[PDB]
């Protein structure tokens, strides 16, 4: 075998280009915790030293007074101002400044806050600090819903009917010229109603700079709701997109390195949604048959490659019961539900992020090699007979600084909830059915505490409906998610 005792040694062994010893976590709560546990576990496996990578957390006074756990957990911490996100966690200039001063070699922002802000990887890059996420050029291309959909369309990925249906760019960096935006947008209600005629109702009237989304059911209530999206986000171009019909939101999980290699990691399915929120996510997305899902994975990989994506991102689609599907978006970050994917794929995602930020290519990540059925520490490249998902995972959102829930019911279920009082439970079974029933048994146990009873019993029932056991897709028009 081989031995590495420090991050600098690891980089030499695994053909990387930047040594990361210390990471600044630009988040709190469960995200901070997850980042540290996932990376520490990989540190132990690799270096036999769980502290081989050090962590620095930012800490608001709210969190310091409370003695939130992530503080104790971290190697060193930096007090930051209280208030709303612009001060502290979503303040790019503050993040960079703290990163430069420590110093750290990279930043992980997770999800929330500043994770989607391209200024973050731009300002880090200029200051020579790594980002655990995609670079700003990729983040910009996906920043505008207009540029994003027409990029998708030029790769011949299916999209829903909309104001810029059929628009295309000539296809090293992909750009979308004024001409295309002008035809993809609607300037005013007149043009909106003309556009609405090619698309049909109901549609979303939506502002590409922003949240700022309205649902319109007819030509008669369009003008008011348009004037409303306009006045909500001033200066934004707006476009229109039709709703899907008998559909679910689903996601391909992509992982890319810094050399143009990208891999799909199965996907996720949102089987229950309410008021624009993900109540139940599943992995893999069994609702979609393989032949069709593999094509959605090929589409996401194409998209990821052409915008020059790095790190872990998700490609969101809409899937109809009649097998049709449509690109919606590339979310340029980890999501809170990512453990679903880790579990079924045996990929430690934040440790994959860390290694990729060190310039390690995909075929040198042990987890990826094993997934693709290769030796754990070989060096030969791999072309991304597909790997099989390992079992099935239900994740459920639970409701009414962080409390953990290790369930007595099963080693296969775990959850958490946070005061500033919502969270998730994650359940693994050998198949969908075992995963559901593990979940139910765990929630029955949750529902013993007075704080969760009312809300969890509601959830238990939801998981026990024939429509859920059968994985039926709701009829009618599909609402958007946040
Ligand atoms: C029974 O645990 C399951 C079941 C189904 C799916 C996922 C899990 C678990 C849930 N989970 C945890 O078990 N743990 C503990 C520490 C108990 C752990 N490290 O085993 C977690 O910390 C944890 C955390 C911090 C999770 C999380 N943080 C943010 C979102 O999810 S999910 C999760 O995710 C796996 C954790 C090990 O690495 C691969 C993911």
Coordinates of C-alpha atoms and ligand atoms in Angstrom, one line a residue:
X1 CA 0.0 0.0 0.0
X2 CA 1.0 3.7 0.2
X3 CA 1.2 6.1 3.1
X4 CA 0.4 9.8 3.3
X5 CA 0.6 11.7 6.6
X6 CA -0.4 15.2 5.6
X7 CA -2.4 17.1 2.9
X8 CA 0.8 18.1 1.1
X9 CA 1.8 14.4 0.9
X10 CA -1.6 13.4 -0.4
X11 CA -1.5 16.0 -3.2
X12 CA 1.8 14.6 -4.5
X13 CA 0.5 11.0 -4.4
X14 CA -2.8 11.7 -6.1
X15 CA -1.6 14.1 -8.9
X16 CA -3.1 17.3 -7.5
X17 CA -2.0 21.0 -7.7
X18 CA -2.9 22.9 -4.6
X19 CA -2.4 21.9 -1.0
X20 CA -5.4 22.7 1.3
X21 CA -4.6 22.3 5.1
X22 CA -7.1 24.7 6.5
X23 CA -10.7 25.4 5.4
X24 CA -12.9 28.3 6.4
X25 CA -16.5 27.4 6.8
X26 CA -18.8 30.2 5.8
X27 CA -21.9 28.8 7.4
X28 CA -23.4 27.7 10.7
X29 CA -25.8 25.0 12.0
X30 CA -26.1 21.6 10.4
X31 CA -24.1 22.7 7.3
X32 CA -21.0 23.5 9.3
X33 CA -21.4 20.3 11.2
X34 CA -21.8 18.1 8.1
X35 CA -18.8 19.6 6.4
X36 CA -16.5 18.9 9.4
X37 CA -17.8 15.4 10.0
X38 CA -17.6 14.3 6.4
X39 CA -14.1 15.7 5.8
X40 CA -12.8 14.5 9.2
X41 CA -14.0 11.0 8.4
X42 CA -12.1 11.1 5.1
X43 CA -9.1 12.6 6.9
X44 CA -9.1 9.6 9.3
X45 CA -9.4 7.0 6.5
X46 CA -6.6 8.7 4.4
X47 CA -4.1 10.1 7.0
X48 CA -5.1 8.3 10.2
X49 CA -5.6 11.7 11.7
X50 CA -9.1 13.1 11.9
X51 CA -7.6 16.7 12.3
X52 CA -5.3 16.5 9.2
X53 CA -7.5 19.2 7.6
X54 CA -8.2 22.1 10.1
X55 CA -11.5 24.0 10.2
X56 CA -12.2 27.6 11.0
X57 CA -15.9 28.7 11.5
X58 CA -17.4 32.1 11.5
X59 CA -19.6 32.8 14.5
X60 CA -22.4 35.4 15.1
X61 CA -23.0 36.5 18.7
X62 CA -26.4 34.8 18.6
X63 CA -24.6 31.5 18.1
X64 CA -21.9 32.3 20.7
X65 CA -24.3 33.1 23.4
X66 CA -26.1 29.8 22.7
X67 CA -22.9 27.8 22.6
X68 CA -24.0 26.2 19.3
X69 CA -22.1 23.0 18.8
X70 CA -20.4 23.8 15.6
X71 CA -18.2 26.2 17.5
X72 CA -16.8 23.6 19.9
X73 CA -16.5 21.2 17.0
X74 CA -14.3 23.5 14.9
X75 CA -10.5 23.9 15.4
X76 CA -10.6 27.7 15.7
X77 CA -13.4 30.3 15.3
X78 CA -13.8 33.9 14.2
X79 CA -16.4 36.2 15.8
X80 CA -18.4 38.0 13.1
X81 CA -21.1 40.8 13.4
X82 CA -24.7 39.8 14.2
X83 CA -27.8 40.8 12.2
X84 CA -29.0 39.6 8.8
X85 CA -26.9 37.7 6.3
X86 CA -25.3 40.7 4.6
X87 CA -23.3 41.2 7.8
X88 CA -21.6 37.8 8.5
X89 CA -22.4 34.6 6.5
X90 CA -23.5 36.1 3.1
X91 CA -20.9 38.9 3.2
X92 CA -18.4 38.1 0.5
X93 CA -15.9 40.8 1.4
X94 CA -15.9 39.6 5.0
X95 CA -15.4 36.0 4.0
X96 CA -12.5 36.7 1.8
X97 CA -11.0 39.1 4.4
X98 CA -11.2 36.4 7.1
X99 CA -9.8 33.8 4.7
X100 CA -6.9 36.0 3.7
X101 CA -6.0 37.0 7.3
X102 CA -6.0 33.5 9.0
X103 CA -4.9 32.4 6.4
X104 CA -6.8 29.4 5.0
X105 CA -6.3 27.8 1.6
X106 CA -10.0 27.3 0.8
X107 CA -13.6 28.2 1.7
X108 CA -16.6 26.0 1.9
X109 CA -20.0 27.8 1.9
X110 CA -22.4 24.8 1.6
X111 CA -25.9 25.9 0.8
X112 CA -27.7 29.0 1.9
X113 CA -26.2 32.4 2.3
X114 CA -23.5 33.2 -0.1
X115 CA -23.3 29.8 -1.8
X116 CA -24.9 31.0 -5.0
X117 CA -23.1 34.3 -5.1
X118 CA -20.6 34.3 -8.0
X119 CA -18.7 37.2 -6.4
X120 CA -17.6 34.6 -3.8
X121 CA -15.4 32.3 -6.0
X122 CA -14.3 35.4 -8.0
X123 CA -13.0 37.3 -5.0
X124 CA -11.5 34.1 -3.6
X125 CA -9.9 33.2 -6.9
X126 CA -8.3 36.7 -7.3
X127 CA -6.9 36.3 -3.8
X128 CA -5.6 32.9 -4.5
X129 CA -7.9 30.9 -2.1
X130 CA -9.8 27.8 -3.3
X131 CA -13.6 27.5 -3.4
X132 CA -15.3 24.2 -2.6
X133 CA -17.8 24.8 -5.5
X134 CA -17.9 25.8 -9.1
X135 CA -15.9 28.7 -10.4
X136 CA -17.5 32.1 -11.1
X137 CA -17.5 31.8 -14.9
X138 CA -19.7 28.6 -14.6
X139 CA -21.7 30.3 -11.9
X140 CA -22.5 33.3 -14.1
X141 CA -23.6 31.2 -17.1
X142 CA -26.1 29.5 -14.8
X143 CA -26.9 32.7 -12.9
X144 CA -29.4 34.0 -15.4
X145 CA -32.3 31.6 -16.1
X146 CA -32.4 33.0 -19.6
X147 CA -28.8 32.3 -20.5
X148 CA -29.2 29.0 -18.7
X149 CA -32.2 27.7 -20.6
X150 CA -30.9 28.8 -24.0
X151 CA -27.6 27.1 -23.3
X152 CA -29.5 24.0 -22.5
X153 CA -31.6 24.3 -25.6
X154 CA -28.4 24.6 -27.8
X155 CA -27.3 21.3 -26.4
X156 CA -30.7 19.9 -27.4
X157 CA -31.8 19.3 -23.9
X158 CA -35.6 19.4 -23.7
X159 CA -37.2 22.5 -22.0
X160 CA -40.8 23.5 -21.2
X161 CA -42.6 25.9 -23.5
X162 CA -41.5 29.4 -22.8
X163 CA -40.8 33.0 -24.0
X164 CA -37.5 31.9 -25.5
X165 CA -38.4 28.4 -26.7
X166 CA -36.2 27.4 -29.6
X167 CA -33.6 30.1 -29.2
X168 CA -30.0 29.0 -29.8
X169 CA -26.4 30.3 -29.7
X170 CA -23.6 29.3 -32.1
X171 CA -21.8 26.3 -30.5
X172 CA -14.2 28.4 -25.4
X173 CA -16.7 30.1 -23.1
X174 CA -20.4 30.1 -24.0
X175 CA -22.1 33.5 -24.2
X176 CA -25.6 34.7 -24.9
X177 CA -25.8 37.9 -27.1
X178 CA -28.3 40.8 -26.5
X179 CA -30.3 39.6 -29.5
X180 CA -31.2 36.3 -27.7
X181 CA -32.3 38.0 -24.4
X182 CA -34.3 40.5 -26.3
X183 CA -36.3 37.6 -27.9
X184 CA -36.4 35.5 -24.7
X185 CA -37.9 38.3 -22.6
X186 CA -41.1 40.3 -22.5
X187 CA -40.8 44.1 -22.2
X188 CA -44.3 44.9 -21.0
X189 CA -47.8 43.4 -20.7
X190 CA -48.6 43.7 -24.5
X191 CA -45.5 41.7 -25.5
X192 CA -46.2 39.4 -22.5
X193 CA -49.7 38.6 -23.8
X194 CA -48.4 38.0 -27.3
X195 CA -45.8 35.7 -25.9
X196 CA -48.4 34.0 -23.7
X197 CA -50.1 33.0 -26.9
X198 CA -47.3 30.8 -28.1
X199 CA -46.9 29.3 -24.6
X200 CA -50.4 28.7 -23.1
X201 CA -51.8 28.9 -19.6
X202 CA -51.1 28.4 -16.8
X203 CA -47.6 29.9 -16.9
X204 CA -45.0 31.5 -14.5
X205 CA -44.3 35.1 -15.0
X206 CA -40.8 35.3 -13.7
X207 CA -37.9 37.8 -13.1
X208 CA -34.4 36.5 -14.2
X209 CA -32.5 38.9 -11.8
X210 CA -34.3 37.3 -8.8
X211 CA -38.6 35.0 -4.7
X212 CA -39.8 37.2 -7.7
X213 CA -42.2 34.7 -9.3
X214 CA -45.9 34.8 -10.0
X215 CA -48.3 32.1 -11.3
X216 CA -50.8 33.2 -14.0
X217 CA -53.8 31.2 -14.9
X218 CA -55.3 33.3 -17.8
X219 CA -54.9 36.3 -20.0
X220 CA -57.3 38.2 -17.8
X221 CA -55.1 38.2 -14.6
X222 CA -51.7 38.4 -16.4
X223 CA -51.3 42.2 -16.5
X224 CA -51.6 42.8 -12.8
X225 CA -49.3 39.9 -11.8
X226 CA -46.8 41.0 -14.5
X227 CA -46.8 44.6 -13.1
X228 CA -46.3 43.0 -9.8
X229 CA -43.2 40.9 -10.7
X230 CA -41.8 44.0 -12.4
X231 CA -42.3 46.3 -9.4
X232 CA -41.0 43.6 -7.1
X233 CA -37.6 43.2 -8.8
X234 CA -37.0 46.6 -10.7
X235 CA -34.6 46.5 -13.6
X236 CA -35.0 42.8 -14.2
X237 CA -35.7 41.2 -17.5
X238 CA -38.8 39.0 -17.3
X239 CA -39.7 35.8 -19.2
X240 CA -42.6 33.4 -19.1
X241 CA -42.6 29.6 -18.7
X242 CA -45.5 27.1 -18.8
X243 CA -46.2 24.9 -15.9
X244 CA -45.7 21.1 -16.1
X245 CA -48.7 18.9 -15.8
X246 CA -48.5 15.6 -14.1
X247 CA -45.0 16.0 -12.9
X248 CA -42.3 15.7 -10.2
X249 CA -39.2 17.8 -9.6
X250 CA -36.1 15.6 -10.0
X251 CA -32.4 16.1 -10.0
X252 CA -29.3 14.6 -11.5
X253 CA -26.4 14.9 -9.1
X254 CA -23.3 15.8 -11.0
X255 CA -19.7 15.8 -9.8
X256 CA -17.0 17.5 -11.9
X257 CA -13.2 18.0 -11.5
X258 CA -10.9 20.7 -12.9
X259 CA -9.9 18.9 -16.1
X260 CA -13.3 18.6 -17.8
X261 CA -14.4 15.2 -16.4
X262 CA -17.8 15.1 -15.0
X263 CA -19.8 12.3 -13.5
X264 CA -23.4 11.8 -12.7
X265 CA -24.3 10.3 -9.3
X266 CA -27.8 9.0 -10.0
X267 CA -30.4 11.5 -9.0
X268 CA -33.1 12.5 -6.5
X269 CA -36.8 12.7 -6.6
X270 CA -39.1 15.0 -4.6
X271 CA -42.0 12.7 -3.9
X272 CA -44.0 15.1 -1.7
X273 CA -44.0 18.9 -2.0
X274 CA -46.1 21.4 -0.1
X275 CA -46.1 25.2 -0.3
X276 CA -43.0 25.2 -2.5
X277 CA -41.0 23.1 -0.1
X278 CA -39.3 19.6 -0.4
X279 CA -41.1 17.4 2.2
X280 CA -39.9 14.0 1.0
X281 CA -36.7 13.5 -1.2
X282 CA -35.8 10.0 -2.4
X283 CA -32.7 8.5 -4.0
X284 CA -32.5 7.0 -6.6
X285 CA -35.3 8.6 -8.6
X286 CA -37.1 5.3 -9.3
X287 CA -40.2 7.2 -10.7
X288 CA -38.1 7.6 -13.9
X289 CA -37.2 4.4 -15.7
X290 CA -33.4 4.0 -16.2
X291 CA -33.4 4.4 -20.0
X292 CA -34.9 7.8 -19.6
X293 CA -32.9 8.7 -16.5
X294 CA -29.6 7.8 -18.1
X295 CA -30.5 10.2 -20.9
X296 CA -31.2 12.9 -18.3
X297 CA -27.8 12.1 -16.7
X298 CA -26.2 12.5 -20.1
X299 CA -27.8 15.8 -20.6
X300 CA -26.7 17.1 -17.2
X301 CA -23.1 16.0 -17.9
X302 CA -23.1 17.7 -21.3
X303 CA -24.4 20.9 -19.6
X304 CA -22.0 20.7 -16.8
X305 CA -19.1 20.3 -19.2
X306 CA -20.0 23.1 -21.5
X307 CA -20.4 25.8 -18.9
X308 CA -17.0 24.6 -17.4
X309 CA -18.5 23.4 -14.1
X310 CA -16.4 22.2 -11.1
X311 CA -17.4 20.7 -7.8
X312 CA -20.8 19.2 -7.0
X313 CA -24.0 20.6 -8.6
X314 CA -27.5 19.5 -9.3
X315 CA -29.4 19.6 -12.6
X316 CA -33.1 20.0 -12.0
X317 CA -35.6 18.6 -14.3
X318 CA -39.4 18.1 -14.4
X319 CA -40.6 14.6 -15.1
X320 CA -44.1 13.8 -16.3
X321 CA -45.9 10.5 -15.9
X322 CA -45.9 10.2 -19.8
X323 CA -42.1 10.0 -19.7
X324 CA -41.4 13.5 -21.0
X325 CA -39.0 15.7 -19.0
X326 CA -37.7 19.2 -19.1
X327 CA -34.6 21.1 -17.9
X328 CA -35.3 23.7 -15.4
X329 CA -32.0 24.8 -13.8
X330 CA -28.6 23.9 -12.5
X331 CA -28.3 24.5 -8.8
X332 CA -24.5 25.3 -8.4
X333 CA -24.0 23.8 -4.9
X334 CA -24.6 21.0 -2.5
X335 CA -28.1 20.8 -1.1
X336 CA -29.2 19.9 2.4
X337 CA -30.5 16.6 1.1
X338 CA -27.2 15.4 -0.5
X339 CA -26.7 12.5 2.0
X340 CA -29.4 10.6 0.1
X341 CA -26.8 10.5 -2.7
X342 CA -23.8 9.9 -0.7
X343 CA -25.5 6.9 0.8
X344 CA -26.7 5.2 -2.4
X345 CA -23.5 6.0 -4.3
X346 CA -20.9 5.5 -1.5
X347 CA -19.4 8.9 -2.3
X348 CA -18.4 11.2 0.5
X349 CA -19.4 14.5 -1.2
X350 CA -17.8 17.2 0.9
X351 CA -14.5 15.2 0.9
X352 CA -14.9 14.9 -2.9
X353 CA -15.2 18.7 -3.0
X354 CA -12.1 19.1 -0.9
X355 CA -10.0 16.8 -3.0
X356 CA -11.2 18.3 -6.3
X357 CA -10.4 21.8 -5.0
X358 CA -6.9 20.4 -4.5
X359 CA -6.9 19.6 -8.2
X360 CA -7.2 15.9 -7.8
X361 CA -9.0 14.4 -10.9
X362 CA -12.1 12.2 -10.7
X363 CA -10.3 9.0 -11.5
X364 CA -8.1 9.5 -8.5
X365 CA -11.0 9.7 -6.0
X366 CA -11.2 6.3 -4.3
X367 CA -15.1 6.5 -4.0
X368 CA -15.5 7.2 -7.7
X369 CA -13.2 4.4 -8.7
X370 CA -15.1 2.0 -6.6
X371 CA -18.4 3.2 -7.8
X372 CA -17.3 2.6 -11.4
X373 CA -16.1 -0.9 -10.4
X374 CA -12.3 -0.1 -10.6
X375 CA -9.6 -0.7 -8.0
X376 CA -9.7 1.8 -5.1
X377 CA -6.2 3.3 -5.7
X378 CA -5.4 2.8 -9.4
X379 CA -4.3 5.6 -11.7
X380 CA -5.8 4.7 -15.1
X381 CA -8.5 6.9 -16.5
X382 CA -12.2 5.9 -16.5
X383 CA -14.9 6.6 -19.1
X384 CA -17.9 8.2 -17.3
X385 CA -22.5 -1.2 -17.9
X386 CA -23.6 1.6 -15.4
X387 CA -23.0 1.3 -11.7
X388 CA -26.1 0.3 -9.6
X389 CA -27.6 2.3 -6.8
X390 CA -27.1 0.7 -3.4
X391 CA -30.5 0.4 -1.9
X392 CA -32.9 3.4 -1.6
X393 CA -33.1 6.4 0.7
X394 CA -36.1 8.4 2.0
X395 CA -35.3 11.9 3.4
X396 CA -38.2 13.7 5.2
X397 CA -38.4 17.3 6.3
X398 CA -39.5 17.6 10.0
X399 CA -40.9 20.6 11.7
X400 CA -42.6 22.5 14.7
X401 CA -27.5 25.3 17.0
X402 CA -28.7 21.8 16.5
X403 CA -30.2 18.7 18.2
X404 CA -29.3 15.3 16.9
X405 CA -31.7 12.3 16.7
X406 CA -30.0 8.8 16.8
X407 CA -33.0 6.6 16.5
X408 CA -33.3 3.4 18.7
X409 CA -35.6 1.9 16.0
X410 CA -32.8 1.4 13.5
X411 CA -29.2 2.0 12.7
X412 CA -30.6 2.9 9.3
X413 CA -32.3 6.1 10.2
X414 CA -30.9 9.4 11.6
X415 CA -32.1 12.9 11.8
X416 CA -31.5 16.4 13.3
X417 CA -33.4 19.6 13.9
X418 CA -32.3 23.1 14.6
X419 CA -33.9 25.9 16.6
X420 CA -33.2 29.1 14.5
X421 CA -37.2 24.1 14.9
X422 CA -37.0 22.3 11.5
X423 CA -34.7 19.6 10.1
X424 CA -34.5 16.3 8.2
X425 CA -34.6 12.5 8.8
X426 CA -32.7 10.2 6.5
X427 CA -33.6 6.6 6.1
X428 CA -31.9 3.7 4.2
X429 CA -33.4 0.5 3.1
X430 CA -32.4 -2.3 0.7
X431 CA -35.3 -1.1 -1.4
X432 CA -37.9 1.7 -1.5
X433 CA -40.3 -0.3 0.6
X434 CA -37.8 -1.1 3.5
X435 CA -36.6 2.5 3.4
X436 CA -40.2 3.8 3.8
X437 CA -41.0 1.4 6.6
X438 CA -37.7 2.1 8.5
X439 CA -38.7 5.8 8.2
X440 CA -42.2 5.2 9.5
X441 CA -40.9 3.3 12.5
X442 CA -38.4 6.1 13.2
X443 CA -41.0 8.8 12.9
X444 CA -43.3 6.9 15.3
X445 CA -40.5 7.2 17.8
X446 CA -39.9 10.9 17.0
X447 CA -43.6 11.6 17.6
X448 CA -43.3 10.7 21.2
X449 CA -41.8 14.1 22.0
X450 CA -44.4 16.7 22.6
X451 CA -42.7 19.2 20.2
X452 CA -43.0 16.9 17.2
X453 CA -46.2 14.9 17.8
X454 CA -48.8 16.9 15.8
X455 CA -46.5 17.5 12.8
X456 CA -44.9 14.1 12.6
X457 CA -48.1 12.1 12.8
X458 CA -49.3 14.2 9.8
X459 CA -46.1 13.1 8.0
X460 CA -46.5 9.4 9.1
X461 CA -49.9 9.4 7.4
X462 CA -48.5 10.9 4.3
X463 CA -45.9 8.1 4.0
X464 CA -48.7 5.5 4.5
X465 CA -51.1 6.6 1.7
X466 CA -51.5 4.2 -1.2
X467 CA -50.5 7.1 -3.5
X468 CA -47.2 7.4 -1.7
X469 CA -46.6 3.6 -1.4
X470 CA -47.3 3.3 -5.1
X471 CA -45.3 6.3 -6.0
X472 CA -48.2 7.9 -7.9
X473 CA -47.5 11.3 -9.4
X474 CA -50.0 14.0 -8.5
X475 CA -52.2 15.2 -11.3
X476 CA -52.6 18.9 -12.1
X477 CA -50.2 21.7 -12.6
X478 CA -46.9 21.6 -10.8
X479 CA -45.9 24.4 -8.4
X480 CA -42.3 25.7 -8.3
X481 CA -39.9 25.1 -5.5
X482 CA -37.6 27.5 -3.7
Ligands
LIG1 C1 -28.8 6.4 8.9 O1 -28.0 7.5 8.4 C2 -28.3 7.8 7.0 C3 -29.4 7.1 6.4 C4 -29.7 7.4 5.1 C5 -29.0 8.5 4.4 C6 -28.0 9.1 5.1 C7 -27.6 8.8 6.4 C8 -26.6 9.5 7.1 C9 -27.1 10.5 8.0 N1 -26.2 11.3 8.8 C10 -25.5 10.8 9.9 O2 -25.5 9.6 10.1 N2 -24.6 11.6 10.6 C11 -23.8 11.0 11.7 C12 -22.7 12.0 12.4 C13 -24.6 10.3 12.9 C14 -22.8 10.2 11.0 N3 -21.7 10.9 10.6 O3 -23.1 9.0 10.7 C15 -24.6 12.9 10.3 O4 -23.8 13.5 11.0 C16 -25.3 13.4 9.3 C17 -25.3 14.7 9.0 C18 -24.5 15.8 9.7 C19 -26.2 14.9 7.9 C20 -26.5 16.1 7.3 N4 -26.0 17.3 7.6 C21 -26.7 18.1 6.8 C22 -27.5 17.5 6.0 O5 -27.5 16.2 6.4 S1 -26.8 13.5 7.5 C23 -26.1 12.6 8.6 O6 -25.8 10.2 6.1 C24 -24.6 9.5 5.9 C25 -23.6 9.9 7.0 C26 -22.3 9.1 6.7 O7 -21.8 9.5 5.4 C27 -22.7 9.3 4.3 C28 -24.0 9.9 4.5

